[PDB]
Amino acid sequence: TKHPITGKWHNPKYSLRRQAELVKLAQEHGVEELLPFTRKLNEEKLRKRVELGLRVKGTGVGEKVKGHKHERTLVAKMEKRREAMLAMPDLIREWKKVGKRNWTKFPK
Amino acid sequence: KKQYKFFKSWDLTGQQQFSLCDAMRYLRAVEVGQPPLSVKYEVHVKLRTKKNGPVVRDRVRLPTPVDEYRERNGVVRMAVGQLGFTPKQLAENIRVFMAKIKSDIGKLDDTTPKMVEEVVLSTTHGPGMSLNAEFAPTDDKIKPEDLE
Amino acid sequence: ASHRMRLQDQGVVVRLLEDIPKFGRKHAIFRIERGRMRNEWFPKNKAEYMTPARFQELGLTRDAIGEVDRSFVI
Amino acid sequence: SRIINVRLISMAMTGYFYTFTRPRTSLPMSMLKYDPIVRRKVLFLEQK
Amino acid sequence: VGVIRRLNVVRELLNIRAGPGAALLPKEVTKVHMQFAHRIEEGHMGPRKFWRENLPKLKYWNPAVPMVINRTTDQKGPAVMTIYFRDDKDAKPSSTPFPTSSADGSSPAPKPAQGERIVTIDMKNRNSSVILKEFLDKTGAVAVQPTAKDEEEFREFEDLHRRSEIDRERIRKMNDAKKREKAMLAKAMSDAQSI
Amino acid sequence: LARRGTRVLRLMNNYSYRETNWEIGRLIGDPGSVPGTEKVGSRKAKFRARRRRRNT
Amino acid sequence: SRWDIEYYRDPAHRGYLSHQLAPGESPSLYFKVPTGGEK
RNA sequence: AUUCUAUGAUUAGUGUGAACGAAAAUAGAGCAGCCUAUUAAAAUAAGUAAAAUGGCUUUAAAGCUGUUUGAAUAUUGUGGG
RNA sequence: CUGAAAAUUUCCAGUGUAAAAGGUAAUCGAUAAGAUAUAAUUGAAACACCUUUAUUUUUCUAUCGUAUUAUUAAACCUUAAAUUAAGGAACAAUUGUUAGAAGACAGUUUAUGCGGGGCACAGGCCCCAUAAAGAGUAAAUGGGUGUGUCUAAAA
RNA sequence: CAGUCGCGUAAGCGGGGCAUAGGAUCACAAGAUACAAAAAGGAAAGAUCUUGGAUUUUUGGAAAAGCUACGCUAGGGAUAA
Ligand SMILES: [K+]
Ligand SMILES: [K+]
Ligand SMILES: [K+]
Ligand SMILES: [K+]
Ligand SMILES: [Mg+2]
Ligand SMILES: [Mg+2]
Ligand SMILES: [Mg+2]
Ligand SMILES: [Mg+2]
Ligand SMILES: [Mg+2]
Ligand SMILES: [Mg+2]
Ligand SMILES: [Mg+2]
Ligand SMILES: [Mg+2]
Ligand SMILES: [Mg+2]
Ligand SMILES: [Mg+2]
Ligand SMILES: [Mg+2]
Ligand SMILES: [Mg+2]
Ligand SMILES: [Mg+2]
Ligand SMILES: [Mg+2]
């Protein structure tokens, strides 16, 4: 509750731990219907799950897995290897023609 | 005594850039009555390039005739269209020039990729105004209009 | 330049109360060195500290802080 | 100081390499070696 | 050449949108035509200033109307301008044929179409002022008023010219003093060579 | 053209689809010889062309 | 987790989440079944 | 909730090594919750949380701390983990 | 190279102190003349005017840095129940950080081998003999100027 | 054995050199593998494979100078006068 005179939120009279002790104690005696609204209620925990479901990063509803780095760069990796082999015959012809001594194109 | 290896690059945070249509409205007024066949636009594109690096000496065949361009000192100057050019024709006439550059840059080495900093636009008797990537006028009342 | 520099203080916010010359007019908010306010202005009642509580009574907000006007004249 | 260890990079861009030694006052090494990733003989060039 | 250098040189030249000759012409007008000589003689200075001072201010607020100029070498040519005021109650006629500017009189005043009625305005040995007012009162148009920011633009650049002229003479006084002093040094060397 | 243009993506692992490296290597030609080292032409063909250019 | 979901999301293991797939969809949350043809 | 005993555990982990060494959880002993505290206390917490730096502790987090600096306002998703 | 106003760019020739390139043929001259420019000349390159850049130099601003000078005009410090006193003074002093620096002080190492130990010297590996017709085989035993290399195969 | 290259008519030869003298791990650095990812999606830091930089020369691998006649303790005829 936000105090009107002072703009500061007052903690609830019963912490989240104590809220669960009453719900667990009120449910064993069939008096859970009398307790006010609480995020610890058995029906509130279940309604929130069925309504929205899992919302964690990636595997949540509407979320998409990001994939590992070696998975994101898989196609671009195999496309580079494929490009080099296709140009392999033309590279050996220029190498065997120019020769091992006069070759000047080297990786960096 | 001191020396630098770069061309002076000013801060653009406070620059006042104009859209292509808003700019021609200012330029077409200063060239009122001038022979449109003897008045042509021009573009100076400043490049963040090093002095030691090479220069650009390629050519470009624009869609509409107004071509050769050369980088002298961290800038490239060349015409892009006559005064009677409509914004639709003048627009693509610029895109063909920027792409041919960015294509030649990437074609160049990766040691110091020359990136563009600003694009200017002026006429033979008009002021040098900055260009914004936008194309349409900010004023909702005015619309694309072509005339002499 | 660097990603981390020396931590420095920018001053304390104060609201003048006697129209100090060469600094600002009466009821002018700005940041001044803590030395002058703590030793010269506060003892002589020439200004007052602008605490978050003082900002509410005056109705102003933290975005009302001005600047020192060295060219001020009485 | 007289001899150096050079890495011959595969031009297939597979990441395999061979390591040989050669004097400094000589030309870079270039050989036709076997790449176990693609399982074929490709051109291997010195790294630098 | 800083960004603010080019910026101040521009915003000053952007007086096109100002009070002197700017106004929003009505949709009734269709096009304009003018013809005058190159030089300023036999009453030809008026139109020139109207072309370099007030005419550009119209195309900014009226960029749809074509305003063309036809210059010539005949200094005695009739410095007269035509205004196609009537658009046939905005009937939107098909006035496709229309000339373009030139410098040798190659684009004279064409004959108006059926739905067009021109308005002649003579100007010879007359000041641009009397020529300007005759253009607005005749071609009824509302004059746009400047905003406060435009008043600051005029006030700022005005105070700037004070600092500029104050420096134009200052730096001028250091160079001539040097060009004078250095001249004394040259004279001294010449005298030394003689001895 | 059809051989070097083909792309066979397989189910290697983790439901991933990619082209095996050993297949990428056999696009240039079948194993047994190193492409590029083979003489494209024939020595006899070169001799015939040498005369043609001389006759003309 | 990703691996646990993908395990019970495929029909090869008869996972109780396999009914959430399409006949062409893949169990992996990142990879997809490429398309065959010439284009 | 805290406290004590055992298991977890010659474990995770750290360490060049030698060695050091948790927690969750389980079982038992006790069990008690509250602010109107069975002794009389809050108008819900700012130089605080936190950061850089010098140390402690430690697994790099968390926690403690001298120096110089320095936030936000509740699931209608503000703050810490 | 913080930014602003203004200005400056000389090998010979050249109307003359050509900053460079790009674009242009008119621009200025309140109505009468003429000055600029283009042309032509010179040069490798030719000029007004509108643009965007380059070099250098002033003032302003911004940023640092040192010295100097003042300060009940209540920082701090010293004498002083301790003051509108006197003097020093943005120093000194203290805290944190940083670099240097005294065995002044502290902990520890300074080995082992060896016809006793000290001093000296020695330490992995290779070849021959000693070695007694398989292999192996020791000594501060005899032989070696032993050894931490060389080498991509090319005019 | 598999893979794929050279030479040779062929048979076949080739996993360096006529043979016998070049030190690890850790840490560090460069490539690859797709293993695991401390709530979850990534990542970091790890693991496997290949490779480099050492008088670690007391070379199965400590970062290391002396005096004692002021000397002490535990031991030795395993060792001198
Ligand atoms: K362990
Ligand atoms: K911490
Ligand atoms: K023997
Ligand atoms: K995770
Ligand atoms: Mg300070
Ligand atoms: Mg325990
Ligand atoms: Mg040890
Ligand atoms: Mg609280
Ligand atoms: Mg803290
Ligand atoms: Mg944290
Ligand atoms: Mg905390
Ligand atoms: Mg004094
Ligand atoms: Mg000692
Ligand atoms: Mg024997
Ligand atoms: Mg040893
Ligand atoms: Mg051994
Ligand atoms: Mg003695
Ligand atoms: Mg004995």
Short mmCIF file of N, CA and C in Angstrom, two decimals, chain A residues 70-71 74-75 78-79 81-82 85-90 92-93 96, chain F residues 4-7 18-19 21 24-25 27-28 34-38 40:
data_model
loop_
_atom_site.label_atom_id
_atom_site.label_comp_id
_atom_site.label_asym_id
_atom_site.label_seq_id
_atom_site.Cartn_x
_atom_site.Cartn_y
_atom_site.Cartn_z
N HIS A 70 28.14 -21.66 -33.40
CA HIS A 70 28.51 -22.64 -34.41
C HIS A 70 27.31 -23.15 -35.20
N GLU A 71 26.09 -22.89 -34.74
CA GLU A 71 24.89 -23.24 -35.49
C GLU A 71 24.43 -22.10 -36.39
N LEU A 74 26.65 -21.95 -39.58
CA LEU A 74 26.84 -23.24 -40.22
C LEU A 74 26.72 -23.15 -41.73
N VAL A 75 25.66 -22.49 -42.22
CA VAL A 75 25.46 -22.37 -43.66
C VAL A 75 26.56 -21.52 -44.28
N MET A 78 29.78 -23.72 -44.49
CA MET A 78 29.81 -24.70 -45.57
C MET A 78 29.73 -24.05 -46.95
N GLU A 79 29.22 -22.83 -47.04
CA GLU A 79 29.21 -22.13 -48.32
C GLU A 79 30.58 -21.58 -48.66
N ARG A 81 33.48 -23.08 -47.66
CA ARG A 81 34.24 -24.26 -48.04
C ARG A 81 33.88 -24.71 -49.45
N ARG A 82 32.59 -24.65 -49.79
CA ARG A 82 32.16 -25.02 -51.13
C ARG A 82 32.72 -24.07 -52.18
N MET A 85 36.48 -24.93 -53.02
CA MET A 85 36.71 -26.12 -53.83
C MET A 85 36.36 -25.86 -55.29
N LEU A 86 35.27 -25.14 -55.54
CA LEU A 86 34.89 -24.84 -56.92
C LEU A 86 36.00 -24.08 -57.63
N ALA A 87 36.69 -23.20 -56.90
CA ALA A 87 37.81 -22.45 -57.43
C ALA A 87 39.14 -23.17 -57.25
N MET A 88 39.10 -24.45 -56.86
CA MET A 88 40.35 -25.18 -56.63
C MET A 88 41.06 -25.50 -57.94
N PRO A 89 40.38 -25.99 -58.98
CA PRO A 89 41.09 -26.28 -60.24
C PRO A 89 41.77 -25.06 -60.84
N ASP A 90 41.08 -23.92 -60.86
CA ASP A 90 41.66 -22.70 -61.41
C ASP A 90 42.81 -22.18 -60.57
N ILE A 92 45.03 -24.25 -58.86
CA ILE A 92 46.19 -25.11 -59.07
C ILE A 92 46.77 -24.91 -60.46
N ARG A 93 45.93 -24.60 -61.45
CA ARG A 93 46.43 -24.31 -62.79
C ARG A 93 47.33 -23.08 -62.77
N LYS A 96 50.56 -24.14 -60.80
CA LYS A 96 51.48 -24.97 -61.57
C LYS A 96 52.02 -24.24 -62.78
N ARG F 4 28.63 -29.36 -60.29
CA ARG F 4 29.11 -28.31 -59.41
C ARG F 4 27.97 -27.47 -58.84
N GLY F 5 26.78 -27.55 -59.43
CA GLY F 5 25.64 -26.80 -58.95
C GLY F 5 24.73 -27.55 -58.01
N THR F 6 24.92 -28.86 -57.87
CA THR F 6 24.09 -29.66 -56.99
C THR F 6 24.48 -29.43 -55.54
N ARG F 7 23.51 -29.62 -54.65
CA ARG F 7 23.72 -29.41 -53.22
C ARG F 7 22.88 -30.43 -52.47
N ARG F 18 23.06 -29.93 -43.56
CA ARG F 18 24.23 -29.32 -44.17
C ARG F 18 24.80 -30.27 -45.22
N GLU F 19 25.79 -29.77 -45.95
CA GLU F 19 26.47 -30.53 -46.99
C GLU F 19 27.77 -31.11 -46.43
N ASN F 21 31.46 -32.48 -46.01
CA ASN F 21 32.69 -31.96 -46.58
C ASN F 21 33.24 -32.89 -47.65
N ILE F 24 31.49 -32.09 -50.81
CA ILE F 24 31.95 -30.82 -51.35
C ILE F 24 33.28 -30.99 -52.07
N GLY F 25 34.10 -31.94 -51.63
CA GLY F 25 35.38 -32.16 -52.28
C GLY F 25 35.27 -32.88 -53.60
N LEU F 27 32.97 -32.38 -55.88
CA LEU F 27 32.22 -31.62 -56.87
C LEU F 27 33.08 -31.30 -58.08
N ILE F 28 34.37 -31.06 -57.87
CA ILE F 28 35.27 -30.73 -58.97
C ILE F 28 35.49 -31.94 -59.87
N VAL F 34 44.14 -35.00 -59.36
CA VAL F 34 44.00 -33.64 -58.84
C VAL F 34 43.59 -32.74 -60.01
N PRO F 35 42.38 -32.19 -60.01
CA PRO F 35 42.01 -31.27 -61.09
C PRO F 35 42.96 -30.08 -61.16
N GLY F 36 43.20 -29.61 -62.38
CA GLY F 36 44.13 -28.54 -62.65
C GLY F 36 45.50 -29.02 -63.06
N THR F 37 45.95 -30.16 -62.53
CA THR F 37 47.22 -30.73 -62.94
C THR F 37 47.13 -31.43 -64.29
N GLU F 38 45.94 -31.85 -64.69
CA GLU F 38 45.77 -32.50 -65.98
C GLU F 38 45.86 -31.47 -67.10
N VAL F 40 44.75 -29.67 -70.14
CA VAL F 40 43.43 -29.51 -70.75
C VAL F 40 43.46 -29.96 -72.21
#
